[PDB]
Amino acid sequence: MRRTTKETDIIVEIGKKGEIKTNDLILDHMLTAFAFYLGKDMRITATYDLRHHLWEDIGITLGEALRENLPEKFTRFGNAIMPMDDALVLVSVDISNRPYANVDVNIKDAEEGFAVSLLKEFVWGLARGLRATIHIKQLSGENAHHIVEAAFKGLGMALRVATKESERVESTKGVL
Amino acid sequence: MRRTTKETDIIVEIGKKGEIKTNDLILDHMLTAFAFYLGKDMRITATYDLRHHLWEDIGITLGEALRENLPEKFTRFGNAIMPMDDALVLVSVDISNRPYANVDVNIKDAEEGFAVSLLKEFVWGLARGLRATIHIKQLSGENAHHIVEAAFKGLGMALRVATKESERVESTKGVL
Amino acid sequence: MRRTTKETDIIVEIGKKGEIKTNDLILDHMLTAFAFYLGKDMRITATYDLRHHLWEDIGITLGEALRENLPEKFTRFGNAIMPMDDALVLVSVDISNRPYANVDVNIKDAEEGFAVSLLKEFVWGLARGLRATIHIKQLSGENAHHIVEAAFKGLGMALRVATKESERVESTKGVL
Amino acid sequence: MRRTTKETDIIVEIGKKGEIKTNDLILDHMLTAFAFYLGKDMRITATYDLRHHLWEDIGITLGEALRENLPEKFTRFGNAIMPMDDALVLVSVDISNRPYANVDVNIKDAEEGFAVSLLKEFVWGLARGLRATIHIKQLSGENAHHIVEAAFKGLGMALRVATKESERVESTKGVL
Amino acid sequence: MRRTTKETDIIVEIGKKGEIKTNDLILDHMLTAFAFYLGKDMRITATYDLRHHLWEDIGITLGEALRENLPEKFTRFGNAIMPMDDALVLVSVDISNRPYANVDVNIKDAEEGFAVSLLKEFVWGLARGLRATIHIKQLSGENAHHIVEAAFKGLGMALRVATKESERVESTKGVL
Amino acid sequence: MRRTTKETDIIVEIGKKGEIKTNDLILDHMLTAFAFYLGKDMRITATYDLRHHLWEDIGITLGEALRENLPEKFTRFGNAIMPMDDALVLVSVDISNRPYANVDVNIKDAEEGFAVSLLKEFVWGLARGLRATIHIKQLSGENAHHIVEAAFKGLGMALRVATKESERVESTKGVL
Ligand SMILES: O=P(O)(O)C[C@@H](O)Cn1cncn1
Ligand SMILES: O=P(O)(O)C[C@@H](O)Cn1cncn1
Ligand SMILES: O=P(O)(O)C[C@@H](O)Cn1cncn1
Ligand SMILES: O=P(O)(O)C[C@@H](O)Cn1cncn1
Ligand SMILES: O=P(O)(O)C[C@@H](O)Cn1cncn1
Ligand SMILES: O=P(O)(O)C[C@@H](O)Cn1cncn1
Ligand SMILES: [Mn+2]
Ligand SMILES: [Mn+2]
Ligand SMILES: [Mn+2]
Ligand SMILES: [Mn+2]
Ligand SMILES: [Mn+2]
Ligand SMILES: [Mn+2]
Ligand SMILES: [Mn+2]
Ligand SMILES: [Mn+2]
Ligand SMILES: [Mn+2]
Ligand SMILES: [Mn+2]
Ligand SMILES: [Mn+2]
Ligand SMILES: [Mn+2]
């Protein structure tokens, strides 16, 4: 999946062994966590002007890539509760075709490179590209890196469950 | 399972392909959700005088029907965390033989047909008929329909887990 | 544009002389306002189970209908400030391909048939179907009908501006 | 229009196709937005010592360039209300010959490169170079980039209106 | 349009080149502003006993004169956002045939001759004579003269829009 | 696993049919719960001077016993949400090699033999002996016995998941 604008140029290829190299070492780490806990190899390359555009557009392109990869009938729902030392983060996903994100974190000890702005824009991008409902709810924690990385691990774990093949269309209304 | 009083007359048949028709369109939708996420066909028909009596007595009868269908040795415990757009609802069930319900929701945007009274009385009815401990804990949300429907989806998912056969009596005291 | 689920069956036909008949007299009035201030005839018909499903699905279908009718190059942005007696409501739209809604109203004098739940679900449906950013911000007011009707008038007026043909792709990133 | 001090050297040429290259990627993006929504090509080049000096002196030089470009009789007033996802920003301009700026924003989620100091100094610079009254009033929002970029888009849109030719001197006192 | 009582005698002639002379220098200035931003010449002369009676009765007579001059089918709605140095004032008009005024200002630095009483009574008079809904909402400001003059400029600008000819009766109910 | 100091002498033998006899009937019950929900037989015997030393040292010894039994590649993460009547307790474990415990309970109705001191010291002992991150987070509840027993049931259930064999080293850093 490739997405190109005048701001960013992003390639996300799920199922291909390859590097994750976005030219942002924080995002590279977060995406490495995401892919590891999703349980899939992926190749991700990006160029960008501003980090916000990178994080958001990575989210969009990753979402679109996940959507393209979905089986016809998929499990739809997946959750994860992820600890990382002091951090404890609930991640809940519904591949609902109703884009929505709610990211509720409370970072006490900030860390350079980790920003709520960037986390939120990645998650909104992902929600919009995948066309999904995504909740990130911090239950405990203080450290920025532990909170944000737990969220990315959790997204991977939750989507591992939600993107699995199902025997039915998982909606009482008969369509998503 | 049939339960008849001077107020209501209710039939719940689990495992039978059939209609869910209670003469309350909101409850029909909630029960459709419940059954879908439980993963069982059911036929439910009711007549009633007042909606409270309907919701409670449906809970009792459904609980009794679930209890009748349990294997001798069952998993006992099941949880679900269910998102619906803004709503995020935790449902926790223990088929404990200790009737108890705790329903903790916070509806900001009310909706006609959706009432905490009716939800609580359905859940207490279910707890009493099944003979179970049931928690409904809203983690996030504003919209009445999203919150209540998430609760019914969650009850279905949780009971899907809790009602499966187990290799042992699931209690250290040796009996339920 | 026809959209059909097990819950609702909706037709929205923009540019066609016809009636607006949803089987909800409040919504019929709101949509009549919307269409009048948009400056287009439309035919709308619906069947539904529950009013929430109606309001949301009308939003979705109307949004998709507006998206289908959008010129290749469109103005993208449109605003309205709409008074109705005590009410004064700001509506701001960006046809951004970034679904988002923020509805901030404060109804002091409630009115049967008018609910924040239903307004919010219509607007989120519209945002998701059109793929747009939509703000509704009450500046003044107390009366439910005045506030909500002002919002619908304002959506029509704002979308009248935003859906007009433009000479260019209205984004510095080169893509919408 | 060129302005040179011991701190900065800035060229702003309105109506010339060219690059916007200030050696600050955030400002380049903001100025690209400004020019796009103004509806004019411009060439902007700068060297600078400190970013504050750049932002302020860009504002001054851009203001002077806009002032030089004004027709004899101009519309004087222009407004914009600009959404960007969560952000909603009102921009109001009066080319009054009374330099004044009031920038009222509330950034909840900060972003590296985006600072209220720099926004305010650009706007004051612009107000002083153009000789104008400028209000930036955040109505909604949390994200720094969305708020600041909406302000720059809004300045462009507002000045598009205010700098258009008029049939009269737009003041009851007979002069500006 | 002439209106005579035992308290005041007022002539308002729209479209006539002429003096604005009410024997109140503050009101003469405000009305000069109003007429300038409306974009019409007018002749206004008054005698009065008390300033309140003047301001109110000028509003009534001006409203009646505007009403008399309306085309059969008129635009109905008009808004303005007007800055004046520190002041930023929103004016919203609906020629609704439902008299109503809401004037919400917050003057920090008072000025002799400028009073909320007089502004409010002019606006209510105008609403009653024209038969219109009028909102004046201060968004920012401290100085009495800047706030009140912005309101009069804004009323002129808003009514410039609202009083233009339209192709239709601008109401879904088919009549005003 | 035998651990002997001048204060305590503890045997924990996982996978062995035997009794749990610590000379503290509360701890015997808690450990019976832990083992049952872990899904393992175990033999535990202890002598001790002071109950704190017992609870802590049981934690340490049990943790070391679990660590000894861990497969080379293990699942690492496990969670449980456990109801017991009024109580609802979240337990989250990461076998991280980063000892940490956070126990957040709120006992309203105290019970002899049940103490936050002792619970916390058992959990910290377990965290240190296993070399793990352990969160215990009360979501609801009042009764001391229900809260504490839910925590022990939850630890068993969570560790059942976390101690299972995996196909890989469960860390992006390549080392645990
Ligand atoms: O789409 P699904 O499968 O979640 C079922 C819908 O009834 C949910 N819903 C969303 N808004 C009101 N109800
Ligand atoms: O009945 P179970 O299997 O949950 C085991 C009991 O010890 C629980 N309990 C209830 N009250 C005090 N303890
Ligand atoms: O897409 P457009 O036209 O609004 C231009 C983007 O730079 C906006 N943006 C959104 N998030 C950060 N920047
Ligand atoms: O200069 P203009 O056209 O806005 C008209 C002036 O009367 C405004 N003003 C500024 N301070 C007091 N009055
Ligand atoms: O008169 P219009 O054109 O604004 C349309 C009316 O429905 C408005 N309204 C006033 N009160 C309740 N509704
Ligand atoms: O050790 P793991 O597998 O959890 C991966 C690490 O990056 C986590 N981490 C801990 N502190 C900062 N990052
Ligand atoms: Mn963004
Ligand atoms: Mn890390
Ligand atoms: Mn009852
Ligand atoms: Mn529903
Ligand atoms: Mn909905
Ligand atoms: Mn109406
Ligand atoms: Mn400065
Ligand atoms: Mn941007
Ligand atoms: Mn009076
Ligand atoms: Mn003046
Ligand atoms: Mn100790
Ligand atoms: Mn017990």
Residue numbers in the entry:
A (entry chain A), B (entry chain B), C (entry chain C), D (entry chain A), E (entry chain B), F (entry chain C): 1 to 176
Passage from the reporting paper:
The program of herbicide development described herein aims to identify inhibitors of imidazoleglycerolphosphate‐dehydratase (IGPD; EC 4.2.1.19), an enzyme of histidine biosynthesis in plants and microorganisms. Previous studies have shown that IGPD is inhibited by triazolylphosphonates, whose potency is based on mimicking key reaction intermediates.
Significantly, the mirror‐image packing of the two enantiomers of C348 in IGPD2 gives rise to equipotency and, as in d/l‐AOPP superinhibitors of phenylalanine ammonia‐lyase, the mimicry of a reaction intermediate gives rise to potent inhibition.
